[PDB]
C-alpha cells in the first residue's frame, strides 16, 4: 500500500514573552515517530516510536543541529512577513509548513510536496511538477521571485525524490512490525431514546489500524449517507483509532437498520444490528 513520510512545522511568535515557539513533528503514515519542541527543558529531537531505538547517537545529534538551524531561519521569516504585510511588532503570528513524500508498495516515489501558510491561510506551495511554485497573494509573489532566482526548487526536489524516499524505506523496514501490522476493528451499537418516538442508533468501531475505514448505515440495502451523523477518525492513545456513526430512526423500527464495517483487516465486512 502507499506509505508517506511527513513533517509538520509550526512557528508561533509571542511578543513580550520572548522568542517564538518552534515545533517539528514527524510521521510515517498515521504514526508519530519523532518530535522537537523549543519550549522543552532541553530541546532535542526525540523518538516517539519504540522502533526508533535502532538509530545511533549520530542520528539524534544531526537532527537536533538541523532543527535549531530551522528555528533561527523561521524567526527571520516572522520578521520578514510583518514587512510584507505592513503589520505591527505587537501581534502574535503563525507560519505552518508540511513537507513529504509518498511511495507505493514497491517503494517507488508517487509524489512529493511542500506547502506554507501564514496565519492559517495558504501562502506558497510547490507544484506537482516539483519544479515551479504557486503563490496565494501579492506577498507570496515576492518570495516566489526570490526562490526562482536562487534555484530553491532544485535543492528541495533532490530531497523529496532522494533523501525522503530512501529514509522512508528504511523506517518501514526497521519498524515493519509496527508500521506493517493490521488491527481489526471491534464494533458494537448503542441505543438512546429521544422525544417524538424516535431513537439514536450509534455504531462504534474500536481499536483498529491503519486509520482508514468505512462505516455505513443501511436500510433496504441503500446506504443512508445523507441522514447519518459521523465523527472524524481519531487516535485512542495506544496507537490505534476509533470512530462512530449514528442514525435517528422511528421507535420500534430499529431492526430494519444495519451497520457495515469495511477495513483492510476484515476478510468480510462486519454487519451489526442492535
Amino acid at each position: 500500500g502507499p506509505h508517506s513520510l511527513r513533517y509538520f512545522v509550526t512557528a508561533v511568535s509571542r511578543p513580550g514573552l520572548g522568542e517564538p515557539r518552534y515545533m517539528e513533528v514527524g510521521y510515517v503514515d498515521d504514526t508519530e515517530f519523532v518530535r522537537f519542541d523549543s519550549d522543552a527543558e532541553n530541546p532535542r529531537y526525540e523518538p516517539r516510536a519504540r522502533w526508533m531505538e535502532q538509530e545511533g547517537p549520530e542520528y539524534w545529534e544531526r537532527e537536533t543541529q538541523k532543527a535549531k538551524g530551522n528555528e533561527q531561519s523561521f524567526r527571520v521569516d516572522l520578521r520578514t512577513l510583518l514587512g510584507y504585510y505592513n503589520q505591527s511588532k505587537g501581534g502574535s503570528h503563525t507560519i505552518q509548513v508540511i513537507s513529504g513524500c509518498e511511495v507505493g508498495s514497491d517503494g517507488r516515489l508517487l509524489r512529493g510536496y511542500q506547502q506554507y501558510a501564514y496565519d492559517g491561510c495558504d501562502y506558497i506551495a510547490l507544484n506537482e511538477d516539483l519544479k515551479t511554485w504557486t503563490a496565494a497573494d501579492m506577498a507570496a509573489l515576492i518570495t516566489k521571485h526570490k526562490w526562482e532566482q536562487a534555484g530553491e526548487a532544485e535543492r528541495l526536489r533532490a530531497y523529496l525524490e532522494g533523501t525522503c524516499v530512501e529514509w522512508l524505506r528504511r523506517y518501514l523496514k526497521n519498524g515493519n512490525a509496527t508500521l506493517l501490522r493490521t488491527d481489526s476493528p471491534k464494533a458494537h451499537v448503542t441505543h438512546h431514546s429521544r422525544p417524538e418516538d424516535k431513537v439514536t442508533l450509534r455504531c462504534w468501531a474500536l481499536g483498529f489500524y491503519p486509520a482508514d475505514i468505512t462505516l455505513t448505515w443501511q436500510l433496504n440495502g441503500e446506504e443512508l449517507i445523507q441522514d447519518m451523523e459521523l465523527v472524524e477518525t481519531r487516535p485512542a492513545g495506544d496507537g490505534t483509532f476509533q470512530k462512530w456513526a449514528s442514525v435517528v430512526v422511528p421507535l420500534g423500527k430499529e431492526q430494519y437498520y444495519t451497520c457495515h464495517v469495511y477495513h483492510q483487516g476484515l476478510p468480510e465486512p462486519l454487519t451489526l444490528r442492535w
Binding site: Y7, E63, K66, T80, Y84, S99, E152, W167
Partner: peptide
C-alpha cells in the same frame, strides 16, 4: 529524516 536549509521567505 527531516528537511533542513529551509529557504528564507
Amino acid at each position: 529524516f527531516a528537511p533542513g536549509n529551509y529557504p528564507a521567505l
